[PDB]
Copies of this chain bind each other. A is one copy, B any other.
Amino acid sequence: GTFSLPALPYAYDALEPSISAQIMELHHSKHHQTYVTNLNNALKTYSTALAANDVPSQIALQAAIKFNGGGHINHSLFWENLCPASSPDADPASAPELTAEIAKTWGSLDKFKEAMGKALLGIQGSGWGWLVKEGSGLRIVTTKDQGPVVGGEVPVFGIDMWEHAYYLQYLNGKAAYVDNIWKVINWKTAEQRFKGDREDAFKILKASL
């Protein structure tokens, strides 16, 4: 249980005006931090419950590990696939192979953005939207709460649709949040994940879910 909060690749105000400095600070230093802290605590306590043959605690702590582990994975991925709007990495030309495949699948990048926006706005309750790479092709999938993408689904990029991700700035207007987050998507990161050029940093953690 020695997981740590990652440093952001940028300052808390670096994604303005798409995402406010207050949201970024809270989202990282409070929400993500709490997932890390509670993940570590559940993992250590789980080791005690296993040795004690305490089946009720094992079941409860496994659920806590899945929730907080998913929160750690998802937010870690999220920071990496965001960048300042002025960065060259926010230009989809940074992702030639990914955008070529997107066009073959949805017709165009704009048509893909429309489809993913509808999926994001359709999530009931808290959750995430993902572009994932499967052997059978690219696909848009959503997960509830802190469910991570696992198995044969390789995450290309994710967008957080929990209300804490946008409410202070956009209020109930989650559509405006989604419209603006496209400006700060790190297409360089998405390309690297699509091509398989980044090792999976959470391979071990996924084994504990």
Binding site for B on A (CB under 8 A): 26, 30-31, 34, 38, 41-42, 44-46, 48-49, 52-64, 67-68, 100-101, 104-107, 111, 118-119, 121-122, 124-127, 130, 132, 134-139, 141-153, 162-164, 167-168, 171-172, 203-204, 206-207
Total copies of the chain:
4
B167 near A163: Cβ-Cβ < 8 Å? yes
Shortest Cβ gap from A98 to chain B (Å): 11
B151 near A137: Cβ-Cβ < 8 Å? yes
What chain B residues lie within 8 Å of A52 (beta carbons)? 41, 44-45
Known: A26-B171, A207-B107. A56 touches B31 (CB 8 A): no
B145 near A124: Cβ-Cβ < 8 Å? yes
B68 near A64: Cβ-Cβ < 8 Å? no
- Within the assembled complex, what's the spacing in Å between the Cα atoms of A203 and B59? 9
Shortest Cβ gap from A132 to chain B (Å): 8
What are 24 of the A-B contact pairs (CB < 8 Å)? A26-B171, A30-B171, A42-B54, A42-B60, A44-B52, A46-B57, A56-B67, A56-B122, A57-B61, A57-B64, A59-B118, A59-B119, A59-B206, A60-B63, A62-B118, A104-B152, A105-B207, A125-B144, A134-B141, A137-B152, A137-B153, A139-B150, A167-B167, A167-B168
A172 near B31: Cβ-Cβ < 8 Å? yes
B41 near A57: Cβ-Cβ < 8 Å? yes
Known: A139-B135, A168-B167. A61 touches B60 (CB 8 A): yes
* Other 20 A-B pairs with CB < 8 A, given A42-B60, A125-B162, A164-B167: A41-B53, A44-B52, A45-B54, A55-B203, A56-B122, A57-B64, A59-B64, A59-B121, A59-B203, A67-B124, A105-B207, A106-B207, A125-B144, A125-B146, A126-B163, A136-B141, A139-B150, A163-B163, A167-B167, A168-B171
